[PDB]
Ligand SMILES: Nc1ncnc2c1ncn2[C@@H]1O[C@H](COP(=O)(O)CP(=O)(O)OP(=O)(O)O)[C@@H](O)[C@H]1O
Ligand SMILES: [Cl-]
Ligand SMILES: [Mg+2]
């Protein structure tokens with residue numbers, strides 16, 4: 001299966017956090033990285049004074065079950081960051097979100113795939129399009145056709 005994972009960081013030098021996360025992602029069992037998008041800069045969306053975020057997407061080949069992949073991405077977040085309660089509302093060292101798990105639809109307490117809001121997030125869609133321009137969502141919509149609406153500015157590189 002190919003899983004598409006969103007990576008975001010806006011704390012403790014985001015490029016360091018993202019490159020460190022890539023190394024950890026490459027160490028997930030029964031899996032390996034196929035490709036990684038360019039790195040995109042996303043200004044804060046709103047009034048809060050937070051650092052710019054670095055956003056990217058990774059295509060990971062894996063024979064793990066979706067829940068097993070999530071185990072590993074959560075583990076990486078917990079191990080790499082100086083994890084804080086306050087990261088839920090402020091700057092955050094690392095966020096690894098499973099955007100897509102192959103063509104599968106998962107609706108469970110722990111795990112919802114496709115990511116519930118990704119179709120509203122240019123900082124997810126644009127890096128995904130860079131690595132998977134031919135992608136079609138489980139609901140049959142083409143990624144290219146979503147972006148061709150021009151509803152999402154193509155983000156600047158990091
Ligand atoms: N597709 C998915 N990828 C990652 N976590 C997911 C997920 N679907 C559900 N979750 C759940 O989301 C929980 C909270 O994760 P958080 O990273 O704190 C949310 P977030 O990424 O800050 O918000 P967002 O999902 O709006 O981007 C996880 O513990 C996990 O159980
Ligand atoms: Cl879908
Ligand atoms: Mg997130």
Ligand SMILES: [Mg+2]
Nearest residue numbers: 095096097098
């Ligand atoms: Mg998350």
